[PDB]
């Protein structure tokens, strides 16, 4: 006698990008295998995958780069079907990213030593691509909200680039007023925008940096990796709107030409985002639509401010519950706010 | 249990190889990044160059 086969998730439909809008049951799974294009700048002569040569001796007083010389993050979007059909007051039914899987495409393209590299010594081969790497990707239901950081505030950027505003010495430290969104492929330069670690309740990003003058780049390729994107509460990146946002950027190191010019190099990136269906509280009830009905039509009023730094609302006493009459009308809360401490 | 289905990626797609090497035919600009035009099948010893 043998043994009755074991059970396995009965695979269903398969095909191109237009598979998605076919409706499924309630406990569906989905697997999405997709990639991205790295944006290294792409100079001329169809060398799509390098950058232009780097500047050598720009002083701090005046910097003049070009659009080509700065790599940028890569982002895209995945449309999704909606799931609710009738009203169904109460609860809704959204998507969820659960398990990512990344893998770099073209990693053995660096073994070319018959290229236009520098002759490394007199009768040997050439010099391979070495130096600083920075690999980075992100999966979420929302655009990747990011923090503005740079050095040398006197840099005047080219006007195709989305760069932070009013450069001071405060921009060389963690500043609060350089917030923005990520809504455009090939526009945000990588030397000016780290991910904001504060604001991301619906975006998980992974990144390992290694600078240095000339260090080896170490790459893996394995189809047994698995990175769980669940949090410590039991959710993944939820999809508020019908989308799923993918953002990444891959730097591989510097290439040396045969005469001495340095120029960058990158590769693409794989993704396998397993999705599924969850049950949440409705964030769009009829009461939200009603307020957005009236607030479209009602007249704009532009008066003196009532929110922000130059505000004029002073003290708001939000109190409901009752209590035994206090023996002080103005009770104080902090014990010593400013400090009258020792020594 | 099946031959190793691979992916064609290369740089400097204007390089001309000898006849023994099975290279990606019709080399385009897309081959230096993720391209879809270069599926293949591993079936032949000493044939597919690893770069």
């Amino acid at each position, epitope marked *: 006698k043998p043994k009755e086969p074991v059970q396995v998730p009965k695979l269903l439909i398969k095909g191109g990008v237009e598979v998605l809008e076919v409706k499924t049951g309630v406990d569906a799974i989905t697997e999405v295998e997709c990639f991205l294009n790295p944006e290294m700048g792409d*100079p001329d002569e169809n060398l*799509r995958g390098f950058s232009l040569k780097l500047s050598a001796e720009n002083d701090f007083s005046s910097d003049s780069p070009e659009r080509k010389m700065l790599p940028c993050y890569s982002t895209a979007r995945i449309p999704l079907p909606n799931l609710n059909e009738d009203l169904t007051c109460g609860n809704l039914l959204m998507w969820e990213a659960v398990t990512v899987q990344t893998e770099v495409i073209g990693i053995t393209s660096m073994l070319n030593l018959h290229a236009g590299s520098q002759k490394v010594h007199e009768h040997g081969g050439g010099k391979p691509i070495q130096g600083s790497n920075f690999h980075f990707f992100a999966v979420g239901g929302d655009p990747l909200e990011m923090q503005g950081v740079l050095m040398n505030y006197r840099t005047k950027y080219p006007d*195709g680039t989305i760069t932070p505003k009013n450069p001071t010495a405060q921009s060389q430290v963690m500043n609060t007023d350089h917030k923005a969104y990520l809504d*455009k492929n090939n526009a945000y330069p990588v030397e000016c925008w780290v991910p904001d670690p504060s604001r991301n309740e619906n975006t998980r990003y992974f990144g390992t940096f290694t600078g240095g003058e000339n260090v080896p780049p170490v790459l893996h390729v394995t189809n047994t990796a698995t990175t769980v994107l669940l949090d410590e509460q039991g959710v993944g990146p939820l999809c508020k709107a019908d989308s799923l946002y993918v953002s990444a950027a891959d730097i591989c190191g510097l290439f040396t030409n045969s005469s001495g010019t340095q120029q960058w190099r990158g590769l693409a990136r794989y993704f396998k985002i397993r999705l599924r269906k969850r049950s949440v509280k409705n964030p769009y009830p009829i009461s939200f639509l009603l307020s957005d009905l009236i607030n479209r039509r009602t007249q704009r009023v532009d008066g003196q401010p009532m929110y922000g730094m130059e505000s004029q609302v002073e003290e708001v006493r939000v109190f409901d519950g009752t209590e035994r009459l206090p023996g002080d009308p103005d009770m104080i809360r902090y014990i010593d706010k400013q400090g009258q401490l020792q020594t | 249990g099946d031959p190793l289905e691979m992916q064609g990626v290369l740089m400097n797609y204007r390089t001309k190889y000898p006849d023994g090497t099975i290279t990606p035919k019709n*080399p*385009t*600009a*897309q081959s230096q*990044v993720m391209n879809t035009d270069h599926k293949a099948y591993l079936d032949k010893n000493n044939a597919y160059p690893v770069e």
Partner: antibody
Framework: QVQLQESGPGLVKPSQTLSLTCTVS??????????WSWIRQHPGKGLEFIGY???????YYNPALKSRLTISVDTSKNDFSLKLSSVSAADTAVYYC???????????????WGQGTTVTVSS | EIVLTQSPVTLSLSPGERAILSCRAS??????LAWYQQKPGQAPRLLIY???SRANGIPARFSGSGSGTDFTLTISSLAPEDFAVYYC???????????FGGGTKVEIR
């Protein structure tokens, strides 16, 4: 280094079928992120888009010309084609053919298109 | 569809001045813009791709600026080999349109 050319008729009678060849030499017509477009420019007006082709069954036409077109590709002579149906006297215009790139520049701009040819239709 | 309304009609401009064109769109596409230079009796040729990126071979006296709807073909100084016919073009992502505009021809006084 890619060289292009054009060829075809020089005079088309009313209510006939027009055919043109956008000759390509020095590159694959099966080229990955490449389209292959047509641009007409009528004497006295600007230019107008007609149609591009993707060699894994991607077509798109200008909806003003109402899907009266077929664009065919023959891989041997490295060249593609174009078909008009039921031409009129208004079609007398110099005709250009060019290429679109998806990952690089993003348009018909890389100094890469046909050198031009003229079509005359009258009585 | 999408229509690129272009204005002015025919600028009467002397050599050496600052020229500005404006290809204001019916709706925002904001990144898939081009600028085609064509002389009469010649073939088309690019000025600016992606609305700000200069072309290799075009010297830096031209530039591109602006995105959203109100676009700008910035010209620092006009050349006697530049008094010709200038166009604009809108691309398309989801739906295939990418038609073209109307044109503005620079008159030489």
């Amino acid at each position: 280094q890619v060289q292009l050319q054009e060829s075809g008729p020089g005079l088309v009678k009313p209510s006939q079928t027009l055919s043109l060849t956008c000759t390509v030499s020095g590159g694959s017509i099966s080229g990955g992120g490449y389209y292959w477009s047509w641009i007409r420019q009528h004497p006295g007006k600007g230019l107008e888009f007609i149609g591009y082709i993707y060699y894994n069954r991607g077509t798109y036409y200008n909806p003003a010309l109402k899907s009266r077109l077929t664009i065919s590709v023959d891989t041997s002579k490295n060249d593609f084609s174009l078909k008009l149906s039921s031409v009129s006297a208004a079609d007398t215009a110099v005709y250009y053919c060019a290429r679109c790139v998806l990952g690089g520049y993003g348009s018909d701009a890389f100094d890469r298109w046909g050198q031009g040819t003229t079509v005359t239709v009258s009585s | 569809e999408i229509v690129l309304t272009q204005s002015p009609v025919t600028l009467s401009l002397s050599p050496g001045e600052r020229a500005i064109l404006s290809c204001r769109a019916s709706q925002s596409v904001s990144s898939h813009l081009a600028w085609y230079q064509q002389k009469p009796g010649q073939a088309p040729r690019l000025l600016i791709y992606d609305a700000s990126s200069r072309a290799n071979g075009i010297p830096a006296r031209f530039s591109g600026s602006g995105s959203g709807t109100d676009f700008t073909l910035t010209i620092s100084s006009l050349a006697p080999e530049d008094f010709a016919v200038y166009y604009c073009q809108q691309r398309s992502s989801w739906p295939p349109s990418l038609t073209f505009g109307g044109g503005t021809k620079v008159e030489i006084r």
